[PDB]
């Protein structure tokens, strides 16, 4: 199946993505505290609900917040100021909270039984955000024998986020705050501060040798 492309508000982004986030892949954000990563989340929940022509996929949205961050008022101003019914694209947002990293497991679970029944619709779900990765994993599996162990749990975990993205041709976006550990998204995205209130972006171990540049605005991101 062909893969498409979900625009990220951001004209520099997009270019350095070649074009978006991809389905049928896990794009990984990382970067420190504070960052942009959970506004870039915020931004491609709106933008895959529009047409194609406007960067989107008609698609709806599943998201999996570990960390009590997910906003539905920014969500509403990010549609309003780009021309979407803001109460239309929060419907179109199922929105969890995994309590843990067993819980968060089982919500990905449950994503597929979601994600069947609107394969056929008119909105397919097209996008799976879990905003944080690796949050429950890190406190959760700790110490002497853990490095091991919390990998082993975090690959099954990315393992079933890449079938549902292959299987059902959804893009997986995540992040993860930012050890030299492997890592199985598909593709890596390093995100950091910048002067002026800028954020700028560079692909790891990637394609596009090059940073983008883009802030965070009313419209969510952008150039």
């Known amino acids: 199946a062909t893969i498409g492309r979900i625009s990220t508000?951001?004209?520099?982004?997009?270019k350095l993505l070649g074009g978006g986030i991809e389905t049928q892949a896990i794009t990984e954000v990382f970067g420190e505290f504070g960052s942009g990563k959970t506004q870039l989340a915020h931004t491609l929940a709106v933008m895959v609900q529009l047409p194609p022509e406007e960067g989107g996929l008609n698609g709806s949205?599943?998201?999996?917040?570990?960390?009590?961050?997910?906003?539905?008022?920014?969500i509403r101003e990010i549609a309003q100021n780009r021309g979407l019914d803001p109460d239309e694209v929060l419907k179109h947002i199922a929105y969890a909270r995994a309590?843990?990293?067993?819980?968060?497991?089982?919500?990905?679970?449950?994503?597929?039984?979601?994600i069947k029944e609107l394969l056929n619709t008119d909105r397919p779900?097209?996008?799976l955000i879990v905003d944080s990765?690796?949050?429950?994993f890190r406190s959760e599996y700790i110490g002497r024998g853990a490095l091991a162990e919390r990998?082993?749990?975090?690959?099954?975990?990315?393992?079933?986020?890449?079938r549902l993205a292959n299987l059902y041709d959804i893009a997986v976006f995540v992040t993860n705050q930012v050890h030299i550990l492997a890592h199985s998204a598909t593709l890596r995205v390093?995100?950091?501060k910048g002067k002026g209130?800028?954020?700028?972006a560079r692909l790891i171990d990637a394609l596009p040798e090059g940073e983008a540049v883009f802030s965070i605005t009313e419209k969510g991101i952008e150039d």
Do not use: C
């Open 133 to 136: 990765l690796t949050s429950h």
């Open 99 to 114: 309590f843990n990293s067993n819980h968060q497991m089982l919500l990905v679970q449950q994503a597929e039984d979601m």
């Open 190 to 192: 390093y995100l950091r």
């Open 151 to 162: 990998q082993q749990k975090l690959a099954k975990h990315l393992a079933d986020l890449h």
């Open 61 to 74: 949205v599943m998201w999996i917040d570990t960390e009590n961050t997910f906003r539905p008022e920014r």
């Open 9 to 14: 508000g951001s004209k520099s982004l997009d």
């Open 197 to 200: 209130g800028k954020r700028i």
């Open 125 to 127: 779900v097209k996008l």
